[PDB]
Every structure is written in structure tokens, then in C-alpha cells.
A paper describes a structure:
Glycoprotein B (gB) refolds between prefusion and postfusion conformations to facilitate herpesvirus entry into host cells. Here we describe stabilization of the prefusion gB ectodomain from herpes simplex virus 1 (HSV-1), determine ectodomain structures at 2.9- to 4.1-Å resolution using cryogenic electron microscopy (cryo-EM) and isolate a prefusion-specific gB-neutralizing antibody termed WS.HSV-1.24. We used structure-based design to identify mutations encoding alterations capable of stabilizing the prefusion conformation of HSV-1 gB and determined both pre- and postfusion gB ectodomain structures. We propose that prefusion HSV-1 gB evades neutralization by most antibodies through an iso-surface display that is coupled to structural plasticity.
We also analysed antibody D48, which has been shown to recognize gB and prevent entry. We determined structures by single-particle cryo-EM of D48 Fab in complex with each of the three versions of stabilized HSV-1 gB that we had designed. With the complex of D48 Fab with gB-Ecto.H516P (3.0-Å resolution), the D48 Fab-recognized gB was in the postfusion conformation (left). Examination of D48 Fab–gB-Ecto.H516P and D48 Fab–gB-Ecto.H516P.L531E structures revealed D48 to straddle the 432–440 loop connecting the α2 helix and β21 strand, with recognition of N-linked glycans N141 and N430 contributing 42% of the interactive surface. The orientation of glycan N141 enforced by D48 binding would sterically clash with the prefusion-specific configuration of the C-terminal DII helix (residues 460–474). Here we provide the molecular basis for the neutralization mechanism of antibody D48 through pre-triggering of the postfusion state (a type of neutralization observed with the severe acute respiratory syndrome coronavirus neutralizing antibody S230).
Numbering used by the authors:
A (entry chain A): 355 to 459, 492 to 556
B (entry chain H): 2 to 52, 52A, 53 to 82, 82A, 82B, 82C, 83 to 100, 100A, ...
C (entry chain L): 1 to 107
D (entry chain B): 111 to 152
E (entry chain C), G (entry chain B): 658 to 707
F (entry chain B): 506 to 556
The structure:
């Protein structure tokens, strides 16, 4: 049976449907981190032109179909769609179709055969981000504490300047 | 907020015309701009869009390849260079800013509209 | 191109009554749709976004609803300043298309 | 720097310190159970 | 006699908030399963011969 | 990755839990000094504590 | 009148240096790409038949 080519063949296949894909910008590059699959993708902040993908008509259809189903299933009662879908070419050869959300409150892409490089990025970021947040609070608390002790040393010196001066002077 | 458009007038078919839209009251560099037309006694129709920084441009199938949208963030002025005009292009052109909901996304909706100017194609 | 069918093209209402304007698209657009208002002699002004988000400063008595390819805009208490042309525009896929428009007038 | 003139206080306004707070309980250790294991694959 | 909460209290301690690291579960993830890689070939000698 | 994350989260949390416990025990220990430092100079003690 | 820096100063605080963990970027890395593994075979039934 004969059928048209463009709507029958694709050069990209839908891999994963992420419900929560947080996008952040730091170091001059967007970082799409998914907490569900524990993966982090890096891009160049420039929307990869979908027209550049050879035989990629199935990608506007597949991406929009998943977005509509996911939005109505979970984000209809709490979030709102902002703009149209955005396609970004991530490091390693992964094309990410992104749909920003807000709270009510010609060539062929070569995909790498291992996503473990991205999983390590998420794991390191998931351990570095909090540990640094807790290293930052401890440092802040220590400084606030030291400034608090000065109120006691200013009075302890009068009681016995010999002992206070000895430990402070060295 | 205030939006003003300049460059309208009567032009012969197949000729070029360039419109300009001045802005004030909002961060021009932080919001995308859109162009809308209103034919006499007809409905509204979108023309084109220019991102906040102008990196991406999108046009309507009825004006793709004929029009040319551009912006100058330094002078906070929007422009739409028109070429190869046709009789069907006779309409009131309005310049409108997108709805700011997120920092760099394009809402593809209109929140502020200008006074509009006429562009009549006659011979 | 996603055609936008808006009806009724024209209807009349009295001050202090309920009205409902229906807008239909040629294909399912989830919730990507906006509503506008254009008073005589003035430029249009946005009212609702994504079929449910009311714009800042818009009266709370005016609200929209619907899903898929069916959408509606309702006003529970008409005021003299509400009589104007209302347009429904979609942004699910390019090119952006507006509705036929419905002119609410005094009856 | 700024100088300050402090009038003698009175009983109109009174302030007190906070009592010692109960510290959090020690985190519970893992409930491991030693045992031999053999992993099988398809 | 007056209650202890009747007088204004000021915290003399330098609060330090500690948020433990939430547990994370890793799910299996493969770009191309071994079955997909095998299917990538245009022809299979095993199936053709069978 | 599950083992690596658990091998790094379990101890780091144990050491985050001890630091928090030690801090609380320390703060409760300083109160014994502030209760006496206030008598020596209530002006300076009240100023830093009141803000 | 003399400046504040004219008198010798001694730090009464117990300094604690905290060096946040520098951000790290992981690049893709494979010992043998899927193309190399396919090329490892001496003969290919697809190419031979073609
Ligand atoms: C990191 O994350 C942050 C998010 O946390 C991200 O974005 C920054 O986020 C902050 C907080 O949201 C942004 O600040 C807000 O930005 C808005 C600016 O408004 C624009 O549009 C105005 C008109 O449209 C808005 O308002 C109308 C109603 O009036 C509404 O219908 C529209 O839908 C739309 O919401 C326009 O007036 C405005 O221009 C004026 O203001 C700017 C300064 O803000 C000034 O430069 C202009 O000359 C002019 O006076 C602008 O074009 C806005 O929604 C919002 O306003 C609220 O807060 C202010 C106080 O800040 C109140 O006074 C006001 O009443 C509102 O409550 C607020 O200002 C900020 O702009 C974002 N930053 C950037 C750089 O975009 C960061 O970008 C992220 N960073 C990275 C690197 O990714
Ligand atoms: C992201 O952008 C960078 C540049 O900012 C791209 O780097 C190019 O990489 C190619 C690889 O063949 C080099 O030939 C070019 O010279 C590089 N350009 C520059 C300006 O240095 C990079 O390829 C982009 N990454 C992705 C994933 O698209
Ligand atoms: C989406 O939520 C709105 C209320 O915010 C509700 O009226 C509507 O029926 C919901 N739509 C779907 C498809 O669940
Ligand atoms: C967490 O720490 C802050 C100080 O950083 C403190 O004000 C707060 O009360 C603490 N607890 C909670 C539940 O926020
Ligand atoms: C870092 O900490 C040390 C003490 O360990 C201290 O002497 C030093 O001044 C701190 N800062 C810098 C920039 O080294």
C-alpha cells in the first residue's frame, strides 16, 4: 500500500514524557532537570529550529499530543499554559520539546547511546545544591554567633582582663 | 502606557511601505511585539511577531516572504517593512505588545494595543 | 490554519442580565485561547487568557469557561460599559486566528 | 556612627529571654539485616 | 500572678535551620534497549534463514 | 546511582543532624551566660538581643 | 582624636572558612559507540546482501 513519505517516516522518536521539567539558566546555558527520571539536559538557550530536522513532522504532532494529555491530566486545575511549545537541542543529541507553565498562585540529530552522563549531572546537582545550601546556612549562623559572643567578651574583659587578654592575644 | 504608529498612507499595488510603532510606559526590551490588521468591516487577523531581543521571527502564511518585521531596543521603536503590496492588504494595522507572564517566553496574546494607522492599496 | 467559529454574530441584552458568547475552533486546542473586547472608537483590550485567567483589573463578574474545541465567555451582570464587540483568538498553533466577533448591543 | 541618648527605662515595657529549646532527637540509623545474596538476570 | 507568655520574649539564640536531604528513588532508564538495538539492523540473518 | 546517592545522603544527613543537635545544645548553654551578662551591663545585652 | 585603625586589633572570633562546592559539568562519554559495536563484526549480512 502506498502512503505519503513525510507523514509516515520520522528521524526522531518520542522517548520520555516528563510531567515536571524544571528549566534554569546559569553559566550561560539552560539546564532542563527532571526529578521524575533523575536526568539533567544542557542546551544553548536558542530554540533549535524544528524545520532543520529532516523528516520531523511527527515531532510537532507527538510533542503536542503528549503536552495536551499531560496538561489536562495534572496541570489543568493548578497551572496555565504560557506561549507555544519550545524545542531546544540538548547536549548529547536529545531534542527537548518544552512547554512553559505558570502557577496560579537540514540535518539529522545524532543521539548518544548512553544517558548515564546526564544522570550523573542530576545526581551531582541533587547533592551539591542542598549540601551548599546547608554549608551556606552554617557559615551564616557561625558569623551571627561570633558577632553575638562579642557582647559577652566586652563585659568578660572587665571582670578579669588578664584571662581575657591572654586567650585573645594568643 | 501609550502606543503610537506612524507611516500609514495610500500606496499603489506592488509597491513598498514601511511602518513604525513607538512605545512608552513599559520595558520594550523585555517584551515581544506583534502586528495585527483590521480590514474594512472584516475581522481581525495577525500579521507577525518579533521576540523581545529579535532572535526569532514568525509570519502569517498570507504575508510570509513579503513583509519584514524588525525592532530597535535602543530606541524602543518597532518597525514593519512591507514590500510587494496587494489590494487585499488594505487594512488598519495595529502594533500590540505581548502579555508578560514569564521573562523570555512569548504569550502569543495581546494586552496593549496602539491607536492604529491606515494602509490603503488603490490604483 | 485553525478556523475560529464565533456565534451568535450579534445579540441584544439589557442592563443587569446574563449573556453567554460561544466560540468554537476547527480542532482541539486544549486551553490556548484568549478573549478580547473592543468598544466603539477604541482599540481592543484583553479580558481572559488561556480561557480561565482573568486579566488584572477586569471585572470579576465576567468569566470564561470551556475545554477542547468548545469555549464560552459569560457575564453574570451586564453594565453599560460592557456593550461592545468581543473577539476570541487562539494561540495553540500558528498562524494566530481571531473569531468572527459578536456585537452585544442595547435591547 | 551615631550617638544615642537613652532615658531611664521604667516598667511600662518589659522583655524576657527564651527558655531552652528541646533539641531534636538523634537521627534513626538504618535498619539493616545482614544476609547472603545471589542476583539473577534474564 | 501572671502567666509566662504575658511578657514579651526575645530569642537569645542564633537560629540555624537544617533541612535533611530528601530521599530520592532512581528508576531504570535506557536510551535504546537491547531489543531496540537488535531491531535497528535492516536485516537479521537468524530470521531470514528461519 | 541509587547506592551512590544513598551512600552520600545517609552520612551527610547524619552529620547535618549532629551539627543541628550540637547547635541547639550550644544555644541552650549560652543562656546560662546571658542570664548573668545582663546584670553586668543590661544596656549592651538588651541592645543586641532586642535588635 | 585618633582613627579606629590606629590601635592594634585582635580577632575575638573563631574564624570558620566555608568553600561551597564548585559546579561541575558532565560531558557524554562512551567506551564504544553503537556504531563502533556494529562495525566490530567482521561481516554484515545487510551490506553483503545489498
Ligand atoms: C529569575 O526568576 C525571576 C522570577 O522570580 C525572573 O523574572 C523576574 O521576576 C520578577 C518578579 O516577577 C519580575 O518583576 C515583575 O515583572 C513584571 C514587569 O512588567 C512588565 O510589563 C508591565 C505591563 O504588563 C504587566 O502588567 C500588566 C498590568 O499592569 C498585566 O496586564 C500584564 O499581563 C503584565 O503582567 C510593564 O508595565 C512593565 O514595565 C514597567 O516596569 C518595569 C520594571 O518592572 C520598568 O522598567 C518599566 O519602565 C515600566 O515601568 C514591564 O514591561 C511585572 O509583572 C511585575 O510587577 C509587579 O511587581 C512590581 C514590583 O516589582 C509592582 O510594582 C507591580 O505592581 C507588580 O506587583 C514585576 O515587576 C522581573 O522583571 C523579572 N526579571 C527579568 C529580568 O525579566 C528572572 O528573569 C529570572 N532570571 C533569569 C536570569 O532567568
Ligand atoms: C552551543 O554553542 C556553541 C558555541 O557557543 C557551539 O560550539 C560550536 O561547536 C562546533 C563543533 O563542531 C565548533 O565547530 C564551533 O566552532 C563551536 N562554536 C563556537 C562559537 O565556539 C556548540 O556546538 C553548541 N551546542 C549545541 C549542542 O548545539
Ligand atoms: C479545568 O479546570 C477548570 C477549572 O479551573 C474546570 O472548569 C474544567 O472543567 C477543567 N477541565 C478539564 C478538561 O478537566
Ligand atoms: C528555620 O530557620 C529560620 C532562620 O533561618 C527560622 O526563622 C525559622 O523559624 C526556622 N524554622 C522554620 C520552621 O522556618
Ligand atoms: C579562611 O579561613 C582561614 C582560617 O581557616 C582564615 O585565616 C582566612 O582569613 C579565611 N579567608 C581567606 C580568604 O583565606
Amino acid at each position: 500500500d502506498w502512503v505519503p513519505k513525510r507523514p509516515s517516516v520520522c528521524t526522531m522518536t518520542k522517548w520520555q514524557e516528563v510531567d515536571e521539567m524544571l528549566r534554569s539558566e546559569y553559566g550561560g546555558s539552560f539546564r532542563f532537570s527532571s526529578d521524575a527520571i533523575s536526568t539533567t539536559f544542557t542546551t544553548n538557550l536558542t530554540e533549535y529550529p524544528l524545520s532543520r530536522v529532516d523528516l520531523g513532522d511527527c515531532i510537532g504532532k507527538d510533542a503536542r499530543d503528549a503536552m495536551d494529555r499531560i496538561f489536562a491530566r495534572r496541570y489543568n486545575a493548578t497551572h496555565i499554559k504560557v506561549g507555544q511549545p519550545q524545542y531546544y537541542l540538548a547536549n548529547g543529541g536529545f531534542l527537548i520539546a518544552y512547554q512553559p507553565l505558570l502557577s496560579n498562585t537540514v540535518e539529522r540529530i545524532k543521539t548518544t547511546s548512553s544517558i548515564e552522563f546526564a544522570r550523573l549531572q542530576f545526581t551531582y546537582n541533587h547533592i551539591q545544591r542542598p549540601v551548599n545550601d546547608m554549608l551556606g546556612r552554617v557559615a551564616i549562623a557561625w558569623c551571627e554567633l561570633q558577632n553575638h559572643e562579642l557582647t559577652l567578651w566586652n563585659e568578660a574583659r572587665k571582670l578579669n582582663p588578664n584571662a581575657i587578654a591572654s586567650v585573645t592575644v594568643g | 502606557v501609550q502606543l503610537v504608529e506612524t507611516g500609514g498612507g495610500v500606496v499603489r499595488p506592488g509597491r513598498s511601505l514601511r511602518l513604525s510603532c513607538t512605545t512608552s510606559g513599559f520595558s520594550f526590551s523585555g517584551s515581544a511585539m506583534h502586528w495585527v490588521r483590521q480590514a474594512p468591516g472584516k475581522g481581525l487577523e495577525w500579521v507577525a511577531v518579533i521576540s523581545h531581543d529579535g532572535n526569532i521571527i514568525q509570519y502569517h502564511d498570507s504575508v510570509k516572504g513579503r513583509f519584514t518585521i524588525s525592532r530597535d531596543n535602543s530606541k524602543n521603536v518597532l518597525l514593519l517593512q512591507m514590500n510587494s503590496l496587494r489590494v487585499d492588504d488594505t487594512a488598519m494595522y495595529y502594533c500590540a505588545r505581548d502579555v508578560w507572564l514569564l521573562p523570555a517566553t512569548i504569550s502569543y496574546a495581546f494586552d496593549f494595543w496602539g491607536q492604529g494607522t491606515m494602509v490603503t492599496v488603490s490604483s | 490554519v485553525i478556523w475560529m467559529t464565533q456565534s451568535p454574530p450579534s445579540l441584544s441584552a439589557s442592563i443587569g442580565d446574563t449573556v453567554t458568547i460561544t466560540c468554537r475552533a476547527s480542532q482541539g486546542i486544549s486551553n490556548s485561547i484568549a478573549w478580547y473586547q473592543r468598544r466603539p472608537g477604541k482599540a481592543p483590550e484583553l479580558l481572559v487568557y488561556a480561557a480561565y485567567r482573568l486579566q488584572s483589573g477586569v471585572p470579576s463578574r465576567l468569566s470564561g469557561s470551556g475545554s477542547g474545541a468548545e469555549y464560552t465567555l459569560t457575564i453574570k451582570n451586564m453594565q453599560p460599559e460592557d456593550f461592545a464587540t468581543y473577539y476570541c483568538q487562539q494561540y495553540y498553533d500558528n498562524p494566530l486566528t481571531f473569531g468572527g466577533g459578536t456585537k452585544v448591543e442595547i435591547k | 556612627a551615631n550617638f544615642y541618648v537613652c532615658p531611664p527605662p521604667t516598667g511600662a515595657t518589659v522583655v524576657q529571654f527564651e527558655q531552652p529549646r528541646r533539641c531534636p532527637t538523634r537521627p534513626e540509623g538504618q535498619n539493616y539485616t545482614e544476609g547472603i545474596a545471589v542476583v539473577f538476570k534474564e | 500572678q501572671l502567666s509566662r507568655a504575658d511578657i514579651t520574649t526575645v530569642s537569645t539564640f542564633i537560629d540555624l535551620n537544617i533541612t535533611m536531604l530528601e530521599d530520592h528513588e532512581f528508576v531504570p532508564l535506557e536510551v535504546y534497549t537491547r531489543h531496540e538495538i537488535k531491531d535497528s539492523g535492516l536485516l537479521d540473518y537468524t530470521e531470514v534463514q528461519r
